[PDB]
């Protein structure tokens, strides 16, 4: 009984650790817009996009 209770508690602990890791990934803004050259190039694509 203690055996599967320890596997339960470590399992939910690893679940919480992966939850915190996914929180850091979601709130970490993984997209970086490619520094400075890529963001101005992307801006050039939107100025070409609103050419319509």
Partner 1 sequence: TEELAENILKWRKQQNEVSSCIPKILAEESYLYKHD
Of 5 and 49, CB closest to partner 1:
49
Please report how close the Cβ of residue 23 comes to partner 1 at its closest, in angstroms. 25
d(CA 29, CA 50): 26
Please report how close the Cβ of residue 44 comes to partner 1 at its closest, in angstroms. 13
In 8-44, which positions are buried (b, 16+ CB within 10 angstroms) versus exposed (e)? eeeeeeeeeeeeeeeeeeeeeeeeeeeeeeeeeeeee
Please report how close the Cβ of residue 48 comes to partner 1 at its closest, in angstroms. 8
Site residues (vs partner 1, CB under 8 A):
45, 48-49
């Amino acid at each position: 009984s203690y055996s599967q209770l320890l596997q339960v508690v470590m399992a939910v602990a690893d679940t919480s650790a992966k939850a915190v890791e996914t929180v850091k990934k979601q709130q970490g803004e993984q997209i970086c817009w490619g520094g400075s050259s890529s963001v101005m190039s992307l801006a050039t694509k939107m100025n070409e996009l609103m050419e319509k």
